[PDB]
Amino acid sequence: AQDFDFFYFVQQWPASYCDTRRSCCYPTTGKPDEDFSIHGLWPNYENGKWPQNCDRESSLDESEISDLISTMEKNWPSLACPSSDGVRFWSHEWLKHGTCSALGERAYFQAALDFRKKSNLLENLKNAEITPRNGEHYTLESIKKAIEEGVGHSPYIECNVDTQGNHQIYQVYLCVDKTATDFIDCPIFPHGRGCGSKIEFPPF
Ligand SMILES: O=c1ccn([C@@H]2O[C@H](CO)[C@@H](O)[C@H]2OP(=O)(O)O)c(=O)[nH]1
């Protein structure tokens, strides 16, 4: 392992990936739950760069996460087309990011699953009365603070735009320490700026 500074734990709102101009295909298991799903757990550097594809000889061995697959199909689905079981996506994230995490394959996926549950984004938002509905009905501030109170750290929100031209919450970034033990304050955040003061939290 070459070591890194921290992890970006990236989750996304499925609805916002499927209501755009691009193509989204439901998993082989069917339409995903109306809940935040995992995009990936990424080893990163504090200088804005990151290591990737650290072991191009370490393919994903499904046997090691066999019993986690049914959960992953629901909490870490692939929305790309054509419809798939998600293995390609998981293989991709493992090879590109997992091999650089210093974590064993099962530990890597379990960590992602554990942090998705711990972050409890959907419920933290409900607690603040922020629920899915059409239109830019919510202030970005209310969303960030609601997650912050429930996680204890401020998230970074990435927004994209739906066919109607509404700016919507697309992905949520939180930071995890390099030992994958707990959430930490992000040393740095990405530099996007697609989130207006008012955004949409699209229903499924
Ligand atoms: O800190 C970062 C920022 C981006 N990425 C990858 O590039 C795509 C940018 O939209 C992101 O979707 C993401 O795609 P992927 O790695 O999942 O395959 C990184 O690897 N590290």
Side-chain angles (χ1 to χ4, degrees):
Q2 286 298 296
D3 188 54
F4 49 98
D5 301 321
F6 65 92
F7 289 97
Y8 264 139
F9 174 52
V10 192
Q11 296 180 73
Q12 70 161 38
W13 185 240
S16 301
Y17 182 92
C18 295
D19 67 354
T20 65
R21 192 179 173 184
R22 277 66 178 300
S23 298
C24 125
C25 286
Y26 294 144
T28 59
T29 47
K31 181 174 178 174
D33 297 308
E34 173 169 292
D35 186 11
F36 287 81
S37 64
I38 297 161
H39 172 156
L41 180 56
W42 314 329
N44 207 285
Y45 294 141
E46 280 182 29
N47 65 14
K49 299 174 186 173
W50 65 82
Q52 66 169 58
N53 306 116
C54 297
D55 192 340
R56 292 173 179 291
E57 297 171 58
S58 173
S59 60
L60 181 74
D61 170 38
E62 304 173 54
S63 66
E64 291 174 49
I65 57 174
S66 306
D67 60 318
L68 303 181
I69 304 291
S70 67
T71 302
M72 287 171 58
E73 299 184 312
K74 289 195 178 184
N75 297 320
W76 198 333
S78 173
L79 301 181
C81 293
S83 177
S84 63
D85 54 25
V87 178
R88 172 187 287 186
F89 183 37
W90 301 325
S91 174
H92 167 69
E93 290 296 311
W94 166 250
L95 289 174
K96 183 174 182 184
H97 298 291
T99 60
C100 303
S101 71
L103 296 176
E105 186 186 297
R106 188 180 175 86
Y108 179 74
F109 288 93
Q110 186 70 64
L113 294 173
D114 287 347
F115 285 108
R116 193 200 69 83
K117 297 180 176 61
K118 295 175 183 177
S119 65
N120 200 44
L121 302 183
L122 190 63
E123 300 299 298
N124 277 315
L125 292 170
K126 290 186 182 179
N127 289 14
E129 294 197 301
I130 300 176
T131 57
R133 57 187 294 175
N134 295 60
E136 314 185 320
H137 187 78
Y138 303 101
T139 66
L140 172 63
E141 284 303 309
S142 66
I143 293 169
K144 291 173 62 62
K145 292 187 182 63
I147 293 174
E148 183 169 50
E149 184 182 66
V151 173
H153 303 281
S154 56
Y156 165 79
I157 307 298
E158 182 183 349
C159 297
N160 66 165
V161 182
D162 69 13
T163 54
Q164 303 175 181
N166 293 302
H167 300 278
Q168 55 190 187
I169 175 168
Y170 174 55
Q171 292 191 139
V172 179
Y173 295 63
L174 285 172
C175 290
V176 175
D177 80 288
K178 66 177 69 176
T179 68
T181 294
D182 182 43
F183 288 120
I184 56 168
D185 295 311
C186 283
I188 56 173
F189 287 120
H191 293 163
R193 60 187 178 74
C195 295
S197 55
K198 276 276 190 173
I199 60 176
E200 181 183 67
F201 182 27
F204 242 132

